[model samples]
Target: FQMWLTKLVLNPASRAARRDLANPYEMHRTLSKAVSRALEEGRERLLWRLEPARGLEPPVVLVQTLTEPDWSVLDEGYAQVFPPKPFHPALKPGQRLRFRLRANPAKRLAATGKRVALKTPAEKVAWLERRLEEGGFRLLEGERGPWVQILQDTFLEVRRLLQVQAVLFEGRLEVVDPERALATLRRGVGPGKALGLGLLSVAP
Candidate 1:
């Protein structure tokens, strides 16, 4: 399968640009238009992440897709768009890489049947640990334990009533199952994806 990556720098000064960034839900609508055919096997196929700003730089959104995307649908002045870059990771077992994921890690309570975010660093890291292992990547030890760091636990207001929890997990790992590792990065991990979460990116 072919994949493409596109970078968009949102013009923070424009109210139109800030509108989508204001609401996670709105951001999805804006991005969905770029890749109108955003479904694969009846699942979300267009994945994007609003990358954290760097040293007061404009907000950058990274988009990845299984098919080529038409970024022209995005409002003209809101962002400065970059051409899509082809991505094909030729992988093998024991490939070491750095990974980043801003995803939601939660557990369902048997009593309430409700999903709640992991409350502590230990709980969150443990959740991430299990996920990576399932994806056939082993979290290598840092100076101390797993080199995982929680970037943020910010809550996004989703349509007012609902809250979308975004928990960022970043670390280094070695591919234990080559095929599985590739699938994980493409499919992403965890949930709250529509609210701008669950885009897993990796680099050597």
Candidate 2:
């Protein structure tokens, strides 16, 4: 299955979006805009299919972690539109979802002697945010401003790397074993897959 999917994504037809990919920031903007438009137009559900990318099940799963015990407060974490119900296997209305972003290994500056070793995609984005802020990036608008941009960009890169690596392993683009790669990913082995593949933002 992995090999077959990889072949489908690596072909010329799949190359359209994958080739010379746009900056991660741009991808996030596009995704956010599309979701916003869909909601405004009263669409029941929005489906984003990856023509070249494979291994993802249809009806892509969007997972969220609990931020607050109060479900109402979760709205504050998301855009204006509410997320679909049943966020997790055993969550209630007031219970927030249980998802988080850790630092993508690919996106992290090499772990050094002093700084704490980053873990999840969320941590990676946070670390980058601090770096950008220290480097003079500021939030001009609301929560979804410059800081958000930094996170979005980080996610974009990570997503891109994941896609590329997935292709490399599954499509036989690289000699490495796809099943092994998937295992490594699950076990948190090798460099993080978040940096290169281009993950821009979280869809609501």
Candidate 3:
């Protein structure tokens, strides 16, 4: 997952790269194209993943960016997935969550202090925690309590932020311990609040 995110940032034709183009017009055009592609591709992939026949609902795909003044709406047949019926407690007070930010010199503006290096899975997790803290982001209640909850909350937060039209790289939910997360949730056993993704991803 970290590799995938890094590739998106470093790819020559990525929005990040185009944003950093020397020419102003070129940069704008480049970013616009990238954003379009992200939405288009994102819709395709998401729909494919959440096939209606499989009992999975298609979640809405919201694309955000600080640089894009207008939070344009895209209704490409995909519905936005709300975390729950209403806003919950863990969504406030700057709870930590994971995010994927671009790190291209050309498209640096999109980063807007949100981007971080992805040298490894550990670094990716660290970046997410740091950004959440710096941005004063809050997770929904129970989000910070366990790994599974964290992943779910992270996805929920991403959707919420995107709905507001805030620019952010895609959010990532790192399952540090798939086994443990699954077991704890399945057995209804509290694992205590697991360490933030930053530490868990790196722990041996």
**Candidate achieving the largest TM-score:** 1
Q: TM-score of every model?
A: 0.93, 0.22, 0.23
Model 2, 1-204: lDDT tens digits are 110000111222233233323433333333334345444555412222132323453212221211211223221222222333332222122221111122333343355533233445455445444432342221123454322322222223333332322211110011123344232222222233222231111111
* Runs with alpha carbons beyond 4 Å of true place in candidate 2: 1-16, 19-22, 37-89, 92-204
Per-residue lDDT of 44-120 in model 1, one digit per residue for the tens?
Answer: 47788988766678899898887778888977688998999899987789888888889888899889999887788
lDDT of 3 by residue, 144-192 (tens): 5323211121221121132111112234333333434322221211111
Best by lDDT: 1
The lowest-lDDT stretch of 10 consecutive residues in candidate 3 is 1-10
Clash count of each predicted structure: 0, 34, 19
lDDT of all predictions: 0.82, 0.27, 0.25
Of candidates 3 and 2, the better by lDDT? 2
In Å, residue 165's CA in model 3 sits off its true spot by: 23
